[PDB]
Amino acid sequence: ELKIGVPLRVSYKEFVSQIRGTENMFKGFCIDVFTAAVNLLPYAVPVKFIPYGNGKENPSYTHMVEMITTGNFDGVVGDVAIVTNRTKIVDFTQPYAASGLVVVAPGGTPIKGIESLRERDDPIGYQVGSFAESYLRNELNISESRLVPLGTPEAYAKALKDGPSKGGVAAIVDERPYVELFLSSNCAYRIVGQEFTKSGWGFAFPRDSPLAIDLSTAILELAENGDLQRIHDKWLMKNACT
Numbered sequence: 316e317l318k319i320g321v322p323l324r325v326s327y328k329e330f331v332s333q334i335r336g337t338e339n340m341f342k343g344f345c346i347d348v349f350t351a352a353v354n355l356l357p358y359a360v361p362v363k364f365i366p367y368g369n370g371k372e373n374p375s376y377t378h379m380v381e382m383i384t385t386g387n388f389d390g391v392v393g394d395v396a397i398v399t400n401r402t403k404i405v406d407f408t409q410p411y412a413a414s415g416l417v418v419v420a421p422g423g424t425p426i427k428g429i430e431s432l433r434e435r436d437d438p439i440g441y442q443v444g445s446f447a448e449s450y451l452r453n454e455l456n457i458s459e460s461r462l463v464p465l466g467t468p469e470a471y472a473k474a475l476k477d478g479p480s481k482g483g484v485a486a487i488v489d490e491r492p493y494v495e496l497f498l499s500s501n502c503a504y505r506i507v508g509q510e511f512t513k514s515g516w517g518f519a520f521p522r523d524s525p526l527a528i529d530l531s532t533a534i535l536e537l538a539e540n541g542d543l544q545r546i547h548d549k550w551l552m553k554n555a556c557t
């Protein structure tokens with residue numbers, strides 16, 4: 316039986332959430348894709364889902380996958396971005412979902428995209444627990460003093476509404492899937508500029524794990540048979556603002 320870590324999310328639970336009143340039962344987009352993929356393997360993969368997080372805020376996704384390296388988890392199933400400090404310690408599947416960072420802002424301010432954000436010195440929101448914090452600090456050399464962690468779409472909206480002068484932010488940098496859910500309930504805001512990274516989401520296993528290989532073939536079959544799109548439509552259909 317594999318001990319599979321699953322992020323205990325407090326927000327954007329469409330992706331993955333613990334079933335209320337349970338410790339080990341989960342649902343969501345990421346769970347349905349993992350189940351559908353495992354069901355295409357020619358061998359059984361018995362799993363027990365183990366929540367990772369304190370239940371009060373979204374967990375550190377990098378710390379979650381580090382639990383594979385110490386042997387606490389046999390793998391991690393969730394909305395986990397396939398980024399370099401993680402691929403060097405664990406093996407991911409190929410992406411089952413596309414992702415990448417975008418800039419969210421009000422229209423009609425100096426923030427037109429990531430370059431105008433880096434040229435300026437305004438506070439920038441990011442999602443609690445996300446790789447985006449390290450990406451902004453290390454890849455783009457944004458001062459840690461500008462970076463404001465936000466835990467929920469209500470927190471995103473309050474920070475954007477308040478803006479830099481009232482303890483909020485000029486813009487939020489986060490992965491497109493979260494941002495599309497956010498904007499569908501918060502149309503006063505928009506993506507400005509282009510998606511400027513492109514790491515997808517994968518399932519994570521120990522280095523050299525054949526599961527990371529075999530499940531990428533299963534992903535091909537879900538993509539071809541229309542099940543990846545059907546599971547997307549089940550959980551993530553949203554009301555466009557435009």
Ligand code: NA
Pocket residue numbers: 397407408409410517
């Ligand atoms: Na990959």
